[PDB]
Amino acid sequence: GIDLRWKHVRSSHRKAPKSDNVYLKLLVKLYRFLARRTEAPFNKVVLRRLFMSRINRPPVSLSRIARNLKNGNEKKTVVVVATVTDDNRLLQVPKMEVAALRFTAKARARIEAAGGRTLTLDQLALEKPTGANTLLLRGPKNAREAVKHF
Amino acid sequence: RTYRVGDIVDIKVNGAVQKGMPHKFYHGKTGVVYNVTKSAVGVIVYKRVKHRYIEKRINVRIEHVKPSRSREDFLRRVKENAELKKKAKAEGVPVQLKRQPAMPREAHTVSIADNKPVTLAPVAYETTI
Amino acid sequence: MGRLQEYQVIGRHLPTEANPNPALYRMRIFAPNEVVAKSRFWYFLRGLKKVKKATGEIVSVNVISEKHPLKVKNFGIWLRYDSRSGTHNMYKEYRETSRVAAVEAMYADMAARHRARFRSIHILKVVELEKTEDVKRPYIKQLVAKNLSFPLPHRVPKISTKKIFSAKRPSTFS
Amino acid sequence: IEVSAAKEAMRPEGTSVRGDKRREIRARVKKNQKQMLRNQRIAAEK
Amino acid sequence: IPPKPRKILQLLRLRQINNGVFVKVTKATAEMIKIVEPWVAYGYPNLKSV
RNA sequence: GGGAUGGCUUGUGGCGGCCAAGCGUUCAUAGCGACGUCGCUUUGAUCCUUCGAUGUCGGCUCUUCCUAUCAUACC
RNA sequence: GACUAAUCGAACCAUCUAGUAGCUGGUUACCGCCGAAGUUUCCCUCAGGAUAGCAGUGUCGACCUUCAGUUUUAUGAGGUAAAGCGAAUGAACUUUAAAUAUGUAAGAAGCCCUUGUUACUUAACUGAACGUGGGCAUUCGAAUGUAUCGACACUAGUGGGCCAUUUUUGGUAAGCAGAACUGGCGAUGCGGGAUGAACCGAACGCGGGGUUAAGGUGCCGGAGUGGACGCUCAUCAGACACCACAAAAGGCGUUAGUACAUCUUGACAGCAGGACGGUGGCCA
RNA sequence: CGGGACCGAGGACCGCGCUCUGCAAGGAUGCUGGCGUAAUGGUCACCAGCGACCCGUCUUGAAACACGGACCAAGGAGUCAA
């Protein structure tokens, strides 16, 4: 016998989505290829967020995007791996290029009416395969009723 | 000698007052002062049970407490390392700034001419006579 | 106790600023090997001069071989041994060809006759008896007698233990 | 003297655990003398 | 095995019976091996052994 | 629903003092101590002082074992 | 407290009703991955509770920062042995200094310097705290190890059990009773102790070969009627003893020793002889 | 320099090399014989050597006690709603 006071630890993170969405499976295959064959850390972070559950992908609003588009970020491509929602408190939407997992109808309409562009993540993979000149944004994780109750 | 909160002190019960004392455990222990009164001080000590440490708090009369020299060597080495490194940068030569453990002894030769060895029996014969 | 050798072990206290040249101490140790010899040296030095192993060093270890291993000699051994009563002096004699053979015979003898194990026995002196008149024990005196000659009655012949059966009854006359 | 952390936290500033037994003794004596003075007053009224 | 010899054997990477390691002799290592002597055999290896 | 001290024991008291071969000790002369001993516990008397069941034993029939032997045998 | 249809300290029948039980019994395929626990701390106890600790599944965060039942180093506790007193003085003497484990500390997240304030404190702009700025990366300032991170969420058993070593406190006629650490067991198979909760070795996927541990090698039984020197003869020896019987015990059993003593000026054992006179000493 | 045992995982080449026409260098090939069927292999019954307590429950720390079990078939116990 061998004395092993320490214990080998199995992985405590997701390695695959629990979702059965076929298009998400295709996206996961594409970003597995990109994070294996490139050196860009952007692709690895994107792959990990594609694995995540919905409470780990809180929505990002247009006012949050407009806040982060200030101070030299007006030309960077915004990348969100969750839903982008509309904020009707934001009366003037700036021009922006946003790639998201999905958009709400009003958010897509307001971005296109302001003159920006909405992209899917596979179009993002085509145009920026190394994540150059991008702004990777997350929504508020702890802004949940249960997390308040913790 | 007055103490302050945060000072490190040793606990040593002295003399005949260590007779039938209810707490023999804290004698010879070292801790940090959290509370000071004129005749007694409050010390945080840690007792280590199974895998974990737990915190104990004791009140010690001043005559059984001295300030400790726990950090004195570390502070002295920090000062000497600073001044040695400054002198080394001035003179353009490297110097050793880390302690090392004691090494095994090296080879040497011992003369016999004025130091002839004395043969010893397991019992000295002077004691036998 | 075992195939012993005699070692000269010389050791000293580690030199200091007050004592740059400490005194050297020599003992003769009967031991199976050098590790045991040095351990016994430090044991006796701790018992005598209060010099510890950590504060001292071994200067020399040498093997003392018998000068004439082909010459039959008589040996007197003065020893002390420890029992439930305490420590007892003993003088005994052995007829051997070397000091190491005498000391091994002493250890087997003390074990057989008094159950005295190795660590309860302190060997104090091993001397070669120079003259026949120096022999005191009758079990050596009968061996040093003039014109000594004896027969060997009732000798069991050496038969291999693997030969179970014999066709003739053996004889005990040679 | 081992002291409880909760008791030391609830302890007033400047006070020590070395006077707690004298505090309890002073409280008990005060109650006893109050009862004694009440008995003396009633006996004087009678 | 008591916890201090168990810890010293772990720090010497001697976790299984008949495991062997090389140790450079300093005081900080010699005292450790002195403590775990009821479980180990050690000595000074020659070039052929190495 | 839950339950149903032990290789013990045997023949010679306790307490207190003394003695004591020995064990210790011999810069302290203390302490332990077998074998013993001494104190307390009616001229063959009196018969006018019986001192508390919580604790349970028996008998019949019949067999065998121990010896710590009452008898028989030898000494 | 008898009887009232084999039913009576309250008949029989149906219903409420699948009444309630904390008590008893039982509770249904397989393989794989992990895997425990017994005063820690608080509360009025028994017909008591929580709770720490120890576990498993999910995640998430830069799985960033390193940390560690270990040694070393400085310094405490244990000054306690020891050496000397041709050092002083006299365990309480000290130049020096034990073993055993043991506390605290050992960096850039650090060390200082300077600036001021203070509602602390100090005789005091004095210390300290609070901030401010600066200097220090020339080595990042012991060793060894490091699939050992952290935070949430949810779920579960056990949370004043047994034995033992060591240490410590009390005791008895003898037993023993409390604590503290550690190990084992409850949850655990294997080899050996003939046998077995507490002993020794060793921890476990299915197989082949090799080598061992504890324990063994006269037969049962794998392996030696193996080698060396001695000891012992028991009218139920002894072979796994240590405790008790049990004592400073009893032995004309047998060996090995120590001390004292005698001895050719003849010891020790014997044999041949002497063993006397005052004197039938005094009293009775 | 001999003597013996157990084993042959992998499946084009690639590598490290060497004693370099080639090799013992990132895992066995070459040569030969008998047989081609119950011969090897397997199942069942039995003998032999060694091994091996009767399950479940309960209790405590554990055993022991105690409780249930003559045998077989079918039925038989964490469900549904808020």
UniProtKB/Swiss-Prot annotation, chain D:
Signal peptide positions are none
Please provide, in alphabetical order, the Gene Ontology terms of the cellular component aspect for this entry. nucleus
| Gene Ontology terms describing biological process | ribosome biogenesis
The residue ranges crossing the membrane are none
The domain of life is: Eukaryota
Q: Note the subunit structure.
A: Component of a hexameric 5S RNP precursor complex, composed of 5S RNA, RRS1, RPF2, RPL5, RPL11 and SYO1; this complex acts as a precursor for ribosome assembly.
Q: What does this protein do?
A: Involved in ribosomal large subunit assembly.
Q: What is this protein called?
A: Ribosome biogenesis regulatory protein homolog
Q: What is the scientific name of the source organism?
A: Chaetomium thermophilum (strain DSM 1495 / CBS 144.50 / IMI 039719)
Lineage of origin: Eukaryota, Fungi, Dikarya, Ascomycota, Pezizomycotina
